[PDB]
Assembly symmetry: C3
Homo-oligomer: 332 residues x 3
Amino acid sequence: LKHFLNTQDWSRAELDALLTQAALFKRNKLGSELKGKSIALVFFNPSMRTRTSFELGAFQLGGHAVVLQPGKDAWPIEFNLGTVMDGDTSEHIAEVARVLGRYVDLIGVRAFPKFVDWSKDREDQVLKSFAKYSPVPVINMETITHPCQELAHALALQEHFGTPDLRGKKYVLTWTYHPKPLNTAVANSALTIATRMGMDVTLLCPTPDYILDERYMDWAAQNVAESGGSLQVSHDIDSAYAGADVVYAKSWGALPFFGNWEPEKPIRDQYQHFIVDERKMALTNNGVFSHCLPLRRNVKATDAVMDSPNCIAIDEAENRLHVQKAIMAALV
Amino acid sequence: LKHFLNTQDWSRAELDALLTQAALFKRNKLGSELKGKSIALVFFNPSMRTRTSFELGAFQLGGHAVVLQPGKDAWPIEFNLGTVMDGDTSEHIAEVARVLGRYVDLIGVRAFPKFVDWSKDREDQVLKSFAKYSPVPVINMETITHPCQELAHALALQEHFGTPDLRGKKYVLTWTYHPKPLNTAVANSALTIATRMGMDVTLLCPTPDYILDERYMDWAAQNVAESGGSLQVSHDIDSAYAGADVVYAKSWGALPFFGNWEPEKPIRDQYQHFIVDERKMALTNNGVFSHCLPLRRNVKATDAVMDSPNCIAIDEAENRLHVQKAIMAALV
Amino acid sequence: LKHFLNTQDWSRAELDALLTQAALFKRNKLGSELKGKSIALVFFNPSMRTRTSFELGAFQLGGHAVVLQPGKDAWPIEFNLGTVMDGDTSEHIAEVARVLGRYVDLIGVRAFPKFVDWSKDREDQVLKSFAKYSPVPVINMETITHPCQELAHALALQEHFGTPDLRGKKYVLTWTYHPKPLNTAVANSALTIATRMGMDVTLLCPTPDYILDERYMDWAAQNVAESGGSLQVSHDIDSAYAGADVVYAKSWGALPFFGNWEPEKPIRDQYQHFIVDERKMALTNNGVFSHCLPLRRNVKATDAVMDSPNCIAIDEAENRLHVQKAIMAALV
Ligand SMILES: CCC[C@H](NC(=O)CCC(=O)O)C(=O)O
Ligand SMILES: CCC[C@H](NC(=O)CCC(=O)O)C(=O)O
Ligand SMILES: CCC[C@H](NC(=O)CCC(=O)O)C(=O)O
């Protein structure tokens, strides 16, 4: 059974076929690839873009999305095996996944880490659980990686450059400031897709403490080695932005401080200048700026940069709709 | 780009065309004016009638509604420009409106005031924001005016009197009691539509303190001057209800006390007798009673009056469904 | 006007016709029995299976479900008559039911007891209210009985035994442990349907205090007397499970302690061994095990029993989808 947990699990041919099916669904939004079909969108965290583009994607293709929010409307779920359920959890993923498997044809899941222990959050339990117990294809709507976002990003970039081949482009994934520590998911996905496309990735971040988990630093290397691109870590703003083509911002808490965020505020608070402004963007080769959103103005990007005609954020967001229909149409 | 923020923004011909398209959709509920189309219903406050009649209206016309609740499921939104977003808000209306503009064809928004400062609530920021940043038509689902409610009311009244011409009818918009201060939205809309239809409007309320904001008192005058109706403020119950044809109840907090509600409870608490009962209703010319709902029994209206065959509240409510399909079918 | 409040309100012929229409909808899930129609699913409590199978059932039949949650998104509702609504409730069921009656074609309601006074919870006020004030058929989605669950259970049992005639089968409805006291709804429904099918029902529970309300003990008797089955209460685990064919587990708080749960914890806490494990299940005539779900592992059933090929829980759950389409298709 094929799922869409990560882009890394897919061959470059399938990924490419996806982006093309996306480009296609963008010219003809209505279809019946999902006629009479349905998808259960399980959200364990907030969502605007994802929730809306899936529900509309299912509709536009003849299917129907059922949005569930364990804890709010649906009963809370347990993921640990053998555990004696006398706590907050009402049922186990083993039952829930099989039950959903009788109602729907596809299951999408969104579950951000708990931020209490990266050793535990990085195992990606929820997604793995759904994938194991579900008889229908499971789709990652973001956990510790955001694969759907990756494709919406890659398509927006290809559209911008008017070509599918993005090799030779200087890609700069940059950490950016945020009052609180956030999920590395989008960053891990930016790196994975940016290196997979064969670009010149530079992971700009404040201190070595902000470097992404090794899993993604290694996926990145394997991707570089096989796409003819390159990976490079930096801690100098100007040198990085220096004549770049693409600039992706994303704020995230330093993994080494997971569970012990107290002594991290003082650290991140002394780097608010990583904010993408006109200055950095100027140092770029007439580069394009984007962010996964929700983006906080004058904190991550400045009003100027967002209002800049070089910000392809809204196009990337809109592509979430097209790229996801490509994934569903494929998995069924 | 045409929106449906207020009925005042529309000509009497368009309004009339709307009510007729509504009367029409009431004879043939199913259609395809919205086939393959969709609408994002953004609620920043509770809703039963509105939420249900839009979601069903979109369905009945071949489209699809996506209900979003910023703060609950969707990320919380910021409306002030330039502000440095390091607070509760996760993204800005400038991004959200443009993003929705890529997914849906219509955007409905509901946002009651915050009741902390009328000077600020009366600017109608949220609706104005959506209208400014959105590339698709925006629909007011209630903020400081309730335009959709207006039309559902006007249609129910016309249906009752068996004619579209409501001139010469004695309309009495009356304040009514409620344990807590409420939005003037429906009252401002009752006045706006009642005077726009050319009726003999009497704004009955406890003390001059309860008179509606000048904006609506002036819209009302312009409407009277152009419809051949009349406007009149009263503080005497009996004299008002006196041989009236229509009676609309709506409880709202006194604007002069916005932000300082403490000294208002004692005031409103000494006017519970404004409750619409059989007595007042008797003093009317076999008048009809209605309320926008949700209505609290034995507080705003008495069990008797609600169960009275002269209460056209449920018909008005039901018309929300028909009148709104007329608005959507028009805006697309 | 016909509703689906309880299976007891229906003749054995109609029930049978239902299960057959369900078996039929299971072979052809898509249909148009509800084309252009809609149903308002009112939930006053959490739900996963119910919410999803109704929303999908409505879709699969050409209709559309509108999910409402009074208190969360919809305005909170009042059910007592004459009461002076100056409290938490914003509107009365008398208005709400009539309003919904203008938007939808069917109304489903879910409202668990409040657990403060069984004398009050057993009157089944909410469901009765909707049934009284609504002009469209009302459907019980669970209150103090779970009729939809009953049929999903009966169909799963018939499917298992490869026959519609379940007479002569030893059915054992067993109480099971749970950290907190729960609704007897499913138990009352298990008993009602198990005796209605003409099986040999044994209501196994800890102490006489755990025996179901008389209403259901009497419905049960009338059902036994008319189906040729039998009813029997037990307090001995082994003797009951002893060569049984079906075993249904369900945890519920003892009625005699409703409102005074403090002195019940110590009581239920000394019966955790009622948990359905391999041992009890072995003492059965190669029996089948099922539970309505959400089920807590190693508390109500053991991992073993749930993973056992004799657990028809997921099939019962899946049948909720088919049996409910039979009910809707019928009521319209
Ligand atoms: C279909 C069962 C619904 C409900 N169950 C609960 O409320 C138990 C929830 C839990 O154990 O968390 C009940 O007991 O009636
Ligand atoms: C697509 C991004 C989702 C999420 N973002 C947040 O949780 C930040 C929310 C905020 O700043 O309010 C994240 O960081 O992964
Ligand atoms: C259509 C009316 C919506 C809203 N009503 C309330 O917020 C009153 C709610 C209550 O009384 O519980 C208002 O006053 O504008």
